[PDB]
Scaffold this active site. Sequence first.
Site, PDB file in Angstrom:
ATOM      1  N   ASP A 147       0.816  -1.206   0.000  1.00 22.29           N
ATOM      2  CA  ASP A 147       0.000   0.000   0.000  1.00 22.29           C
ATOM      3  C   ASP A 147       0.855   1.264   0.000  1.00 22.29           C
ATOM      4  OD1 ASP A 147      -2.484   1.245  -0.166  1.00 22.29           O
ATOM      5  OD2 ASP A 147      -2.626   1.433   2.031  1.00 22.29           O
ATOM      6  N   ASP A 366      -9.239  -6.502   9.036  1.00 21.18           N
ATOM      7  CA  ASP A 366      -8.673  -5.401   8.259  1.00 21.18           C
ATOM      8  C   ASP A 366      -8.886  -4.046   8.926  1.00 21.18           C
ATOM      9  OD1 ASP A 366      -7.866  -7.178   6.181  1.00 21.18           O
ATOM     10  OD2 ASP A 366      -9.911  -7.148   5.327  1.00 21.18           O
TER      11      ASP A 366
END
Length: 424
Positions: A147, A366
């Site tokens: 990311d 998450d």
Amino acid sequence: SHVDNPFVGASGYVNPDYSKEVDSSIVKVKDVQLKAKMQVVKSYPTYVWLDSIDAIYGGSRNAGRLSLQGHLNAALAQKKANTPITVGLVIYDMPGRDCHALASNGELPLTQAGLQRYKTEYIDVIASTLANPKYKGLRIVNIIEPDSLPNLVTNQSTPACGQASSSGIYEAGIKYALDKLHAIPNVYNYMDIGHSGWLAWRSNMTPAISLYTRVVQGTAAGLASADGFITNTANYTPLHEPNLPNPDLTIGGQPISSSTFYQWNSVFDESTYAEVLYNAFVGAGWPSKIGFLIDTGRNGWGGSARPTSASGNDVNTYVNSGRVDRRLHRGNWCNQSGAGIGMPPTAAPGGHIHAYVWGKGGGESDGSSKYIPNKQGKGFDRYCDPTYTTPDGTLTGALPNAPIAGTWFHAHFVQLVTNAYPAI
């Protein structure tokens, strides 16, 4: 010493913390066949996320988890005679981490002071731990900062991402990580390169390829600092879309790639994505031997409603009838409902794929679906809120009543095992 593909002929390190998480679910379920499928799931290697400086030390500094040295010690005890073993690590503490997230949990600020902490308290400590002669018989396989870089190409309109670019800090952090980790000869580095395919789309491909090329080329060893790339880290995009093999197929005069779900993106699955990237990197002058990992921990999209065919007189009906990825929007990344475990960790499954890996062990959250009091500084990202309408105009698809990021989510776990493809 440094082999082309560290997964070939090797076992993998099975993290006892993931086993302990899975055990916490086994004792809650009375279905003995489900218990058994969970026993099998915890027999597979899963990657260890070093998501903070505290994660290096473990114990009371990281929710009771093993320290980095504890992981490496356990890995030694699992190594078979004359058989290599891979130890999977996620290098994940970039300054200004997750610049496109609504609420990042990254501890380090996007400043030069932040970058120096990254170098000294995070990368240097990891590198000196891994360089210990005690661990020379282990193959360390790093997922390098998920990311991070892709946001510099696709999300520059987000101010945090524009600053990650203009400050140079993302590129400086990656270069330092690669330099210090590649210097250890039994360490293998795979660059995270997202999952959606938007990096490869139209005018994004050249800056994406040139970005990764420029960053790794500037390291001391050049392109040799990265053994390959990894896609789908912690995401859900399927390995294959078996009922939609041709994105250019036209229905009602329009290609199915132009359906609502794909929005003119011709990359439907991770197999197609990895090959598109491979060819582009070889085109940019990378060695032909570069390999790709795919994270298959949560991308199976199985269960008894998985489509077996596609039919419909318009591209939306057709695509929605046939896609195995059932998400409301490909941008939905958090605690996805309906998702299932994908391919088990698999060495050298074919072509330029070095391995299927479980980058994120199925069952870990998450992010929480609200702000939950905690001492790890984990916040509330609305993409984890089932009720939130995203900027893309759909709900999130996140499961409700989710615990904080990186801790066990029993309801998601049961769902992931039940919906595994291939079945457990």
